[PDB]
Design a protein around this ligand. Structure first.
Ligand SMILES: *C(=O)[C@@H]([C@@H]1NC(C(=O)O)=C(S[C@@H]2CN[C@H](CNS(N)(=O)=O)C2)[C@@H]1C)[C@@H](C)O
Length: 244
């Protein structure tokens, strides 16, 4: 039916029309495919930004720094987004990308344990530096879109080196959409502490039949853009490829 030339052209056009530069990497079984309008982004390093929340949550839970029902209280200080001015569980903080919660979690884990855990799972360049509460936001920790799709593939298949229950607890936190029997699990990212800014959407689709298809979208955000472009491009791409 549809030629891969036409798939490549369609997905490129989604990035072109959002007036950005980006890539989406899709993995099917063992085969990695790179689509978009700036393919060379695929092996370039960027800050993980809020995508690190997934591994922050795995580490915190595995090491009993939190539980999935624990309510992280708002301290009452003004926050960047009014939606973050409330009490929340890790799960809620995951959907809202509430960095103050993931910062508190990182502080509980602590620098020594954080570094050792980031090494053990071999995440990105694995370097967190000396600042426990912003290493995923402004450097030194970096990761390529290929490395992110591989992380999502690992987590989707319970292959990371954490208890199965830890991985299931985090995965539950990541359900963002259901489309005709398919379930989309993903974590968004928007790094505003770097120039240029980076947008991420990394997760997988779980199809009706049980197959999991991981993906990582990576693009350049500029002041002005709506964050929902990350989602809109992702769904359009997955739909174009008949994955959903
Ligand atoms: C982490 O990257 C960063 C989070 N990440 C996001 C995000 O949307 O991925 C935000 S933006 C904030 C939370 N969601 C609201 C926007 N919704 S949407 N659909 O993206 O337009 C406002 C924030 C910058 C941490 C480090 O702050």
């Amino acid at each position: 039916h549809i030629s891969s030339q036409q798939h490549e052209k369609a997905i490129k056009s989604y990035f072109d029309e959002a007036q950005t530069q980006g890539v989406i990497i899709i993995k099917e079984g063992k085969n990695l495919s790179t689509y978009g309008n700036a393919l060379a982004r695929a092996n370039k390093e960027y800050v993980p930004a809020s995508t690190f929340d997934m591994l922050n949550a795995l580490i915190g839970l595995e090491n009993h720094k939190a539980t999935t029902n624990e309510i992280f209280k708002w301290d009452g200080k003004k926050r960047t987004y009014p939606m973050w001015e409330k009490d929340m569980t890790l799960g809620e903080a995951m959907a809202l990308s509430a960095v103050p919660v993931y910062q508190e979690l990182a502080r509980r884990t602590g620098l020594e344990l954080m570094q050792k855990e980031v090494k053990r799972v071999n995440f990105g360049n694995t370097n967190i530096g000396t600042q426990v509460d912003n290493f995923w936001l402004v450097g030194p920790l970096k990761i390529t879109p290929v490395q992110e799709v591989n992380f999502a593939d690992d987590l989707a298949h319970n292959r990371l080196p954490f208890k199965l229950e830890t991985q299931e607890e985090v995965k539950k936190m990541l359900l963002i959409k259901e489309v005709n029997g398919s379930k989309i699990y993903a974590k968004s990212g928007w790094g505003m502490g770097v120039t240029p800014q980076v947008g991420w959407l990394t997760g997988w689709v779980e199809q009706a039949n049980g197959k999991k298809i991981p993906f990582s979208l990576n693009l350049e955000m500029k002041e002005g853009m709506s964050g929902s472009i990350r989602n809109e491009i992702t769904y359009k791409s997955l739909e174009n490829l008949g994955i959903i």
